[PDB]
C-alpha cells in the first residue's frame, strides 16, 4: 500500500519556466486524488472529462504531471479549446483533453522584492503548437525578405519577454503554480490503481 | 432577500485601531469569497482587503500589508476586518462585497451600504 | 502594476443618443468588469466579463473589445444614467476613473 510521489511534483523546491516546462511520467504507483482534492488550498481544480470524486476507483496506466508558472490571469487558458498567448505558444492542450488542472497562488515563494527575472515566456514564434509540444529554441526571429543569423537586429527579436514578479503586483498577476493532471490508457495492463 | 450591513464605523485617534463589522445573511455564507472596497472622497475607487472563500488564501495591496488583517467566522455569519495603526490615507467609506465564484477571481455582485471611518484627532 | 485609465473626465451625451465609455489598460488582460453608482449610492454590477448584462440592468447597454481596450456603450442613453461608471479588473488593486455620465 505504497503511495506514489505527488510530494515531488506539488511543493517543489523551484518549479520551471513555461517555454520549457518540466514533464514528469508516473509509473508502479497508487494515488489518491481525494488528497490533493480535499486539501482545499487550491484555487482552481477543474477537470475535463473524469468526475473528481469518483477518481480513486479509476484504474489507470500511466499518469503525466506536467508543471509550469504562468501568471494569474492567464491560468484560463490552460483548458481545452481556450487561445490566447500562452495557449498557443506555450503550453496546449488537444481537444479531446481528460484530465485535472490544479492550480493555486505562489507568491510568497516566487518572488524577490527587486522581482525575479528567471520565470520567462514565449513571445514570438512561426506558428502554434500542436498539442503537448514543447519547443525550447533559442534561436532570433524574423518577418520579411531578410534574415538575420543571430545580429538581433530591425525585424529580428528574441523569443522570449521575462515575466516582471513583483511583491506588489495585483491578485491576478502574482505568479500562480499549475499543474496539469493528465491521464491515458495504452494497451498494457493496469500499473496506477488508487 | 441578500442584504450586508456595516457597523462599527466613527471617528478614531491617528495611530488607533479598531475592529470593521460586516454582517450577512441570507445566503451560503462559507461558499463564497468576499472583499473590503474602500472609497477615499475623491469618488475615486480602491481595492484594500481580500479574503478567498475557505479562509485559506488572504490578500493585500501593497500599501497596507503589515496594517489591515482581515478576518472571517462562519458561525456567526460575519466578517471583521482588523485596522491598525491607521496614517492620513485611510478616512475613506469602506464597503462589504460579495464575489460570485469559489476564489477572488470573479465579478462582485452584491455590495454594503457602507461606514464612515475618518482620521482625525 | 496596473493602472486603469478613462478618458474624458466627464462625458456628455444628450437624450437616447449614443455614447460610448473608454477603460484603458497599461497591459493586456482578458476580461473587464463595469460597476456602477449614483450619487450617495454604493455601486452595483452592470457588466461582467465585458459582455453580459447583470441581472437588473436594462437591455440597452453593451459593451466589447479584449487585450488592451475595453468599452461600455448605451445605444440609446435615459434619464436615469446619471451616474459614475468604474470598470475595475481583477488584477489591478486600484479601480478605474469614473467617467460621469450626465445628460446634455
Known amino acids: 500500500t505504497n503511495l506514489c510521489p505527488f510530494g515531488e511534483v506539488f511543493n517543489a523546491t523551484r518549479f520551471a519556466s513555461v517555454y520549457a516546462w518540466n514533464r514528469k511520467r508516473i509509473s508502479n504507483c497508487v494515488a489518491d486524488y481525494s488528497v490533493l482534492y480535499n486539501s482545499a488550498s487550491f484555487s482552481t481544480f477543474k477537470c475535463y472529462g473524469v468526475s473528481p470524486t469518483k477518481l480513486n476507483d479509476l484504474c489507470f496506466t500511466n499518469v503525466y504531471a506536467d508543471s509550469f508558472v504562468i501568471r494569474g490571469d492567464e491560468v484560463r487558458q490552460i483548458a481545452p479549446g481556450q487561445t490566447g498567448k500562452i495557449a498557443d505558444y506555450n503550453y496546449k492542450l488537444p481537444d479531446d483533453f481528460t484530465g485535472c488542472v490544479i492550480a493555486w497562488n505562489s507568491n510568497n515563494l516566487d518572488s524577490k522584492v527587486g522581482g525575479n527575472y528567471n520565470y520567462l515566456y514565449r513571445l514570438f514564434r512561426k506558428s502554434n503548437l500542436k498539442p503537448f509540444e514543447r519547443d525550447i529554441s533559442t534561436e532570433i526571429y524574423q518577418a520579411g525578405s531578410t534574415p538575420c543569423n543571430g545580429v538581433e537586429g530591425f525585424n529580428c527579436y528574441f523569443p522570449l519577454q521575462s515575466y516582471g514578479f513583483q511583491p506588489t503586483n495585483g491578485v491576478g498577476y502574482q505568479p500562480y503554480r499549475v499543474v496539469v493532471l493528465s491521464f491515458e490508457l495504452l494497451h498494457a495492463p493496469a500499473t496506477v490503481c488508487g | 432577500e441578500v442584504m450586508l450591513v456595516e457597523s462599527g464605523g466613527g471617528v478614531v485617534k491617528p495611530g488607533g485601531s479598531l475592529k470593521l463589522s460586516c454582517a450577512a445573511s441570507?445566503?451560503?455564507?462559507?461558499?463564497?469569497?468576499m472583499s473590503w472596497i474602500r472609497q477615499t472622497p475623491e469618488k475615486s475607487l480602491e481595492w484594500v482587503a481580500a479574503?478567498?472563500?475557505?479562509?485559506?488564501?488572504?490578500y493585500y495591496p501593497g500599501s497596507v500589508k503589515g496594517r489591515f488583517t482581515i478576518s472571517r467566522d462562519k458561525a456567526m455569519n460575519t466578517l471583521y476586518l482588523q485596522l491598525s495603526s491607521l496614517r492620513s490615507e485611510d478616512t475613506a467609506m469602506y464597503y462589504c462585497?460579495?464575489?460570485?465564484?469559489?476564489?477572488?477571481?470573479?465579478?462582485?455582485?452584491?455590495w454594503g451600504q457602507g461606514t464612515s471611518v475618518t482620521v482625525s484627532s | 502594476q496596473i493602472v486603469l485609465t478613462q478618458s474624458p473626465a466627464i462625458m456628455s451625451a444628450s437624450l437616447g443618443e449614443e455614447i460610448t465609455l473608454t477603460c484603458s489598460v497599461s497591459?493586456?488582460?482578458?476580461?473587464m468588469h463595469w460597476y456602477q453608482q449614483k450619487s450617495g449610492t454604493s455601486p452595483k454590477v452592470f457588466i461582467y466579463?465585458?459582455?453580459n448584462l447583470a441581472s437588473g440592468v436594462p437591455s440597452r447597454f453593451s459593451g466589447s473589445g479584449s487585450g488592451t481596450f475595453y468599452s461600455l456603450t448605451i445605444s440609446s442613453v435615459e434619464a436615469e444614467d446619471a451616474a459614475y461608471y468604474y470598470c475595475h479588473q481583477w488584477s489591478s488593486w486600484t479601480f478605474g476613473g469614473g467617467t460621469k455620465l450626465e445628460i446634455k
Open positions: 441570507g445566503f451560503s455564507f462559507s461558499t463564497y469569497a
Open positions: 497591459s493586456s488582460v482578458s476580461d
Open positions: 479574503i478567498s472563500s475557505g479562509g485559506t488564501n488572504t
Open positions: 462585497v460579495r464575489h460570485s465564484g469559489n476564489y477572488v477571481d470573479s465579478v462582485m455582485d452584491y
Open positions: 466579463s465585458t459582455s
